[PDB]
């Protein structure tokens, strides 16, 4: 949850978008929702990535803040 994984506003917005979609497609597993998210992402507006953007730097800030004696 608070690790420097290769995520981003997309995997950040898509993690809820896939969760928000999986609800609608509880069978659409990763191998499929993946094209959904990445297709829901490009289907966004770029300027609408304001929140999913800072939400990345935050979860990234919550990770390092967690490891002091780095």
Curated annotation (Swiss-Prot):
It is found in: Nucleus. Disruption phenotype: Newborn mice display mild skeletal abnormalities. Mice lacking both Sox5 and Sox6 develop a severe chondrodysplasia characterized by the virtual absence of cartilage: chondrogenic cells are largely arrested at the stage of chondrogenic mesenchymal condensations. Embryos lacking Sox5 (homozygous knockout) and heterozygous for Sox6 live until birth and show severe growth plate chondrocyte defects. Embryos lacking Sox6 (homozygous knockout) and heterozygous for Sox5 live until birth and show severe growth plate chondrocyte defects. Residues 3-70 bind DNA. Induction: Expression is dependent on SOX9. Transcription factor involved in chondrocytes differentiation and cartilage formation. Specifically binds the 5'-AACAAT-3' DNA motif present in enhancers and super-enhancers and promotes expression of genes important for chondrogenesis, including cartilage matrix protein-coding genes, such as COL2A1 and AGC1. Forms homodimers and heterodimers with SOX6. This is Transcription factor SOX-5.
